[PDB]
Structure 1
């Protein structure tokens, strides 16, 4: 409780309000608010792994995960679908994958040409500190 309570969230980049996490042709990308269930993520603390899993409300047997190419993915449940969030300011988090890649952590990251992310896929890339703008994502309601 208090900290990321189970429920239905929206997921943005700090690079722009007015854009939401959504799946498209099987990638995850930030897109224009559609007020629909495609953009609503159900996030569930699983106390057995002290980590959280995140399902897509409109296809809720599919969870956020990643592939052996860089990308974050929607997939059926897997240990990869487990995430270990770090809050660093109201509603903003740096999502680390629970299980470490080599000796170093990875995170959701998203590229910006100039604080612009329009057509960009969400990927999984090494993390280091709390100071990477791209690694930062905000989860509301």
Structure 2
């Protein structure tokens, strides 16, 4: 466990590519080639009222990263399913955990790969059991 994440703007990448960043594009969330655009920039805000963090796209305020009934992470004007606990495991590496309820299974952002290829993969909300799983480790780079 660790947090140590200030409020501000970040880019988000996976362990599979230095060149692919989490971007909101054609109404879809995925990892795309590095750009200077506002759609691959993320606003991190810690919220004390109910703990944990909210992520919003800077090209799209008013809506948060949330998970739906299909287990997809997506941009929502919410309900909310939007609160996240980034668990720090290295200098800028995090497991992004769902905050929900005790004694049940932990859930985290999961980015599937086919032999290190993540093209067109969505981020899914799936069970988490350790801090070792490459598909559940994200790098948050401060801007």
Question: When the two structures are superposed, what TM-score results if normalisation uses the length of structure 2?
Answer: 0.92
Q: Secondary structure at the match of 1:49?
A: coil
Contact 2:54 2:65 in 1 (8 A): yes
Kindly state the Cα deviation for residue 14 of structure 1 after the two structures are TM-superposed. 1.2
Where does residue 117 of structure 1 map in the other structure? 118
* Contact 2:25-2:39 at 8 Å conserved across structures: no
Cα distance in 2 for residues equivalent to 1:86 and 1:37: 25
Q: Corresponding residue for 2:38? A: 37
* Distance of 2:109 and 2:95 partners within structure 1: 7
Structure 1: which 5+ runs fail to align?
Answer: none
1:66-85 residue pairs with structure 2 within 5 A?
Answer: 66-85=67-86
Aligned to 1:97: 98
Is the Cα contact below 8 Å between 1:70 and 1:125 reproduced in 2? yes
Write the distance in 2 (CA, Å) between the matches of 1:138 and 1:21.
10
**Structure 1 ranges of 4+ moved more than 4 A:** none
The 8 Å contact of residues 19 and 32 in structure 1, kept in 2 or not, is answered as: yes
Which segments of 5 or more consecutive residues in structure 2 lack a partner in the other structure? Answer: none
RMSD: 1.7
Structure 2 partner of 1:134 = 135
1:69 aligns to what SS in structure 2? Answer: coil
**Aligned-pair CA distance for 1:119:** 1.5
Query: Contact 1:9–1:139 (CA<8 Å) still a contact in 2?
Result: yes
- Matched position secondary structure for 1:95: strand
